[PDB]
């Protein structure tokens, strides 16, 4: 009961540390130069340092990974905060990607074995709700702290990191088949091809349609996060029914494409534009679904499965936004059809199960 509560704070810190850099970066984007290609490289640092290093966590996972990774996060983020020049920030984001791609398999694996055979409800619902809570509260916390001594937010998430060591070392205690991996590992990429390509561009699709000042869209998406959290807390009923393992993903994808289709024809900012935020609920029942699926293929050694998630979901989350930004200009509605396309691709790939279930 307390090990798991200590454990969530690591993941909360990782994604709050991704979210805390947004309201401080423009302060020294002008103090270092940092042209467009340099900023794209700074983004890709975290991507290709999370990519290959994450399966290695599952290579090593069979306690120790979480604590070394969290020291790595704190050191990484301090050295980001030092901020000499690009030669420092680039390697800082690389080692930070190392840390956040080593702790994420460590947590995503070790929850899957300490928790009892009801491992879905509290455990994975809150592990994929605290992720969104960190993404929300990143800029929200960073707003107050960036006003005073703009370096302060950074090592703030630095200082907490050291705290997140001690709780995770004294309040907690310790106690093959590449073919079967194929079904979700490609699957989790496909949605991450477009879902990311959706989310990244939601602040540009609904500023060229009905006008959204930055506060209104923030209200829309905070509401989406809250009313998606309040649905993935009672997630255990919905997964205990709906033919647990794999069927649920298909129904969520059909729901999402339906509400996207309804979204393409929505004017009227407050009535039928704001309220259609509920689309993201259909995209927030699937991340716990694939994480549980990964934890359920591998009987032991859940670290490998969590790592194989956290590498290719980051591959999708990196490939997608570039494509969506590139082909956004040829339309205004281009991001939506990417999400529709990948959702129907997901529907196609999940219904392959019946032929696969017909043989072993």
């Amino acid at each position, epitope marked *: 009961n307390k090990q798991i509560f200590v454990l969530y704070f690591n993941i909360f810190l990782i994604f709050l540390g991704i979210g805390l850099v947004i309201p401080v970066l423009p302060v020294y984007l002008k103090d270092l130069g940092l042209t467009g290609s340099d900023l794209g490289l700074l983004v890709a640092a975290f991507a290709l340092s999370q990519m290959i290093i994450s399966p290695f966590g599952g290579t090593l996972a069979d306690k120790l990974i979480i604590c070394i990774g969290l020291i790595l996060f704190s050191v990484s983020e301090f050295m980001f905060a030092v901020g000499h020049n690009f030669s420092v920030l680039m390697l800082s984001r690389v080692i930070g990607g190392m840390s956040a791609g080593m702790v994420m398999p460590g947590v995503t694996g070790l929850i899957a074995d300490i928790s009892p055979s009801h491992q879905k409800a509290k455990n994975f619902g809150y592990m994929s709700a605290i992720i969104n809570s960190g993404f929300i509260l990143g*800029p929200g916390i960073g707003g107050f702290m960036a006003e005073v001594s703009h370096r302060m937010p950074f090592y703030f998430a630095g200082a907490l990191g050291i705290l997140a060591f001690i709780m995770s070392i004294v309040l907690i205690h310790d106690p093959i088949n590449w073919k079967v991996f194929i079904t979700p590992v490609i699957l989790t990429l496909v949605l991450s091809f477009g879902l990311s390509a959706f*989310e*990244t561009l939601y*602040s*540009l699709y609904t500023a060229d349609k009905v006008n959204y000042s930055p506060k209104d869209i923030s209200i829309a998406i905070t509401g989406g996060g809250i009313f998606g959290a309040l649905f993935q807390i009672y997630f255990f009923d919905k997964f205990m029914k709906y033919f647990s393992e794999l069927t649920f993903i298909a129904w969520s994808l059909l729901y999402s494409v339906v509400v996207l289709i309804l979204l393409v024809f929505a004017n009227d900012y407050w009535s039928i534009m704001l309220i259609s935020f509920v689309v993201f609920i259909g995209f927030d029942m699937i991340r716990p679904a694939i994480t549980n699926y990964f934890s359920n293929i591998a009987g032991e050694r859940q670290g490998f499965a969590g790592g194989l998630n956290s590498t290719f979901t980051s591959m999708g989350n990196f490939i997608g936004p570039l494509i969506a*930004g590139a082909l956004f200009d040829v339309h205004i509605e281009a991001p939506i059809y990417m999400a529709i396309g990948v959702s129907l691709a997901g529907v196609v790939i999940v219904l392959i199960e019946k032929q696969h279930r017909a043989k072993l």
Partner: antibody
Amino acid sequence: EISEVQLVESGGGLVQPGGSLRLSCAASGFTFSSSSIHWVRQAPGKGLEWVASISSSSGSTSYADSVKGRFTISADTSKNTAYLQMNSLRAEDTAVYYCARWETGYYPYWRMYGFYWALDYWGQGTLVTVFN
Amino acid sequence: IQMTQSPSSLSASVGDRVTITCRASQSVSSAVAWYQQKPGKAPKLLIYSASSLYSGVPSRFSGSRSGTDFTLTISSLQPEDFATYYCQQSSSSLITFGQGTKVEIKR
């Protein structure tokens, strides 16, 4: 705000129509390897008008339609500068050619509103005078 | 492509509100900037991508997208805000400036 990027230009002066100037916008203080260079101009009295451009790496020399074909713009990353040819001069080309640099992007953050940035840097300009 | 900009002379006393509007010939994007040029110096950039203040710029220079009617709004003019204001369209690699708006003091 701690910035010292200075763009300088040199090479104006009196000409004859059909002459050949070649205007050096000697960049400084930045990684020329990945940036844009834009050449604007201002006739005496009127308002600004864009006449050439170049992307230093992985780009093509975009031009203005009214004065396309009489200029050959090229950027030499070796000596940290960028030049612009000057051929078949007409009386409509007396001007004050600034050398400018612009970028603009978006740093997105997961279905919130993240960023915008401009980076802005301009020059000083050389009076180019035409038919005498 | 053109970028019609109106009006071409403002005689506004110190501390009052002014509004300058550009009308793109085609709806391009949220990509418009709003330079200003002091007499005989270089243009500086004030607002980029149609809404975002530049660093080191007073908070009065509040821009506003409106359909294709990109606008710049100064709440109050001050003795350092009396110079020509240009608006630039950053289209697909065919840049075009505006016809030019002047701002002049009242006696």
